[PDB]
Design an enzyme around this catalytic site. Structure first.
Site, mmCIF file in Angstrom:
data_model
loop_
_atom_site.group_PDB
_atom_site.id
_atom_site.type_symbol
_atom_site.label_atom_id
_atom_site.label_comp_id
_atom_site.label_asym_id
_atom_site.label_seq_id
_atom_site.Cartn_x
_atom_site.Cartn_y
_atom_site.Cartn_z
ATOM 1 N N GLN A 21 40.851 11.555 141.719
ATOM 2 C CA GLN A 21 41.908 11.184 142.642
ATOM 3 C C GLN A 21 42.984 10.435 141.893
ATOM 4 O OE1 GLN A 21 41.458 8.608 145.995
ATOM 5 N NE2 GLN A 21 40.975 6.780 144.775
ATOM 6 N N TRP A 22 44.235 10.701 142.249
ATOM 7 C CA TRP A 22 45.365 9.926 141.755
ATOM 8 C C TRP A 22 46.280 9.581 142.907
ATOM 9 C CZ3 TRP A 22 45.894 6.826 138.143
ATOM 10 C CH2 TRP A 22 47.145 6.279 137.825
ATOM 11 N N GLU A 226 29.418 -0.044 141.128
ATOM 12 C CA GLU A 226 30.823 0.237 140.855
ATOM 13 C C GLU A 226 31.213 1.589 141.416
ATOM 14 O OE1 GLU A 226 31.016 -3.431 139.672
ATOM 15 O OE2 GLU A 226 32.674 -2.128 140.242
HETATM 16 O O1 LIG Z 1 47.736 3.961 140.237
HETATM 17 C C1 LIG Z 1 46.555 4.347 140.359
HETATM 18 C C2 LIG Z 1 45.607 3.852 139.476
HETATM 19 C C3 LIG Z 1 44.284 4.279 139.571
HETATM 20 N N1 LIG Z 1 43.922 5.117 140.544
HETATM 21 C C4 LIG Z 1 42.523 5.564 140.666
HETATM 22 O O2 LIG Z 1 41.637 4.631 140.088
HETATM 23 C C5 LIG Z 1 40.997 5.181 138.938
HETATM 24 C C6 LIG Z 1 41.296 4.340 137.716
HETATM 25 O O3 LIG Z 1 41.417 2.966 138.022
HETATM 26 P P1 LIG Z 1 40.982 1.968 136.816
HETATM 27 O O4 LIG Z 1 39.499 2.064 136.692
HETATM 28 O O5 LIG Z 1 41.778 2.308 135.597
HETATM 29 O O6 LIG Z 1 41.264 0.445 137.291
HETATM 30 P P2 LIG Z 1 40.077 -0.662 137.311
HETATM 31 O O7 LIG Z 1 39.156 -0.353 138.462
HETATM 32 O O8 LIG Z 1 39.392 -0.643 135.958
HETATM 33 O O9 LIG Z 1 40.766 -1.989 137.582
HETATM 34 C C7 LIG Z 1 41.528 6.582 138.725
HETATM 35 O O10 LIG Z 1 40.470 7.525 138.619
HETATM 36 C C8 LIG Z 1 42.367 6.872 139.943
HETATM 37 O O11 LIG Z 1 41.695 7.796 140.789
HETATM 38 C C9 LIG Z 1 44.894 5.622 141.430
HETATM 39 O O12 LIG Z 1 44.566 6.445 142.318
HETATM 40 N N2 LIG Z 1 46.179 5.216 141.318
#
Ligand SMILES: O=c1ccn([C@@H]2O[C@H](COP(=O)(O)OP(=O)(O)O)[C@@H](O)[C@H]2O)c(=O)[nH]1
Ligand SMILES: [Mn+2]
EC number: 2.4.1.-
Length: 304
Positions: A21-22, A226
């Site tokens: 997902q993005w 997580e």
């Molecule tokens: O602007 C963003 C950033 C992250 N993600 C989602 O969150 C995941 C990555 O987040 P990350 O783990 O880098 O952040 P953390 O949880 O480590 O703070 C990706 O697979 C994306 O699906 C998103 O949807 N939009």
């Protein structure tokens, strides 16, 4: 099938989809004719989604995206679907999520009514303030739990929709009518990974405890569930609905923590001793062909 009870470990075909997902608050950051998926040299997320696809060519790979994207970015997405038949890109706009909804007004009132039953001494006083204030303010416009999760929730926007997508799971690929997908059936599972996850070698089938497993991180000497990894046997896997039940009942509930982690605990009746770490080992999605999570080393995709 570990304790307390015996739980049927489940196994799902190679034809299990993979889900990415993005969610982009800021589609302007990228150009207007290329992919609105980020791949900084710090965080090559789009490159990771591309690498995964190649390897498990047999498997379906889906991307769940939302934001106000410019057409050439959509045209860019359409091109990648041509580049790789195994990649599908699903938008939030194209999926019905109404079934999972509960209007904001009811959530507060049921909390108020429940809080009102107990006597004035026993009631949570601050909570009732917050509830009635929220009820009056949230009145303006539209009261839906989904609408409640906007870009301004920021963190909440994708976390909550991450659970919505996994609830749909296999159905999600079917619902969008994504093509080249004749492997699987409704009431079929799907695996979510963060783009943090780099996949070395194709994974084959996997045994997960009761149709679900999640990511576990153990630092310093402690482990907590997580959302980097979510594996489901099923669409509408009871652990997620139980997590959604919290989303519908608990005020100010966090989709990350309550939506899933709490849901899983509920499903396996963890509490409370019941030492966690071993339970985290029981629930842990384990694989030797995935690196997790590669935001750890550099900077989280969320700026800092
Ligand atoms: O602007 C963003 C950033 C992250 N993600 C989602 O969150 C995941 C990555 O987040 P990350 O783990 O880098 O952040 P953390 O949880 O480590 O703070 C990706 O697979 C994306 O699906 C998103 O949807 N939009
Ligand atoms: Mn990360």
């Amino acid at each position: 099938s570990f304790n307390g009870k015996d739980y049927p470990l489940c196994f799902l075909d190679e034809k299990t989809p993979l889900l990415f997902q993005w969610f982009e608050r800021n589609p302007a950051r990228f150009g207007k004719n290329d992919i609105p998926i980020i791949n900084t040299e710090k965080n090559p997320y789009l490159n990771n989604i591309i690498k995964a696809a190649t390897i498990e060519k047999e498997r379906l790979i889906g991307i769940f995206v939302d934001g106000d994207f410019f057409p050439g970015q959509k045209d860019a997405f359409s091109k990648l679907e041509y580049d790789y038949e195994n990649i599908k890109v699903i938008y939030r706009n194209d999926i019905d999520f109404s079934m999972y909804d509960k209007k904001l007004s009811e959530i507060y009132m049921e909390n108020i009514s429940k809080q009102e039953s107990m006597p004035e001494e026993k009631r949570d006083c601050h909570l009732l303030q917050l509830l009635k204030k929220e009820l009056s303010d949230i009145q303006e416009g539209n009261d839906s739990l989904i609408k409640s999760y906007l870009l301004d929730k920021g963190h909440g926007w994708f976390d909550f929709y991450r659970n919505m997508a996994m609830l749909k799971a296999g159905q999600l690929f079917l619902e969008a009518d994504k093509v080249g997908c004749y492997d699987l059936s409704t009431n079929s599972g799907c695996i979510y990974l963060d783009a943090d996850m780099i996949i070395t070698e194709k994974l084959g089938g996997i045994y997960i405890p009761d149709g679900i497993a999640v990511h576990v991180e153990r630092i310093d000497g402690r482990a907590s569930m997580e959302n980097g990894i979510i594996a489901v046997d099923r669409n509408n896997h009871p652990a997620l609905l139980a997590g959604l039940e919290i989303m519908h009942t608990k005020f100010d509930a966090d989709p990350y923590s309550d939506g899933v982690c709490n849901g899983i605990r509920k499903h396996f009746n963890y509490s409370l001793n019941e030492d966690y770490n071993s339970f985290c080992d029981f629930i842990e999605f384990k694989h030797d062909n995935i690196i997790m999570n590669t935001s750890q080393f550099t900077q989280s995709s969320w700026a800092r």
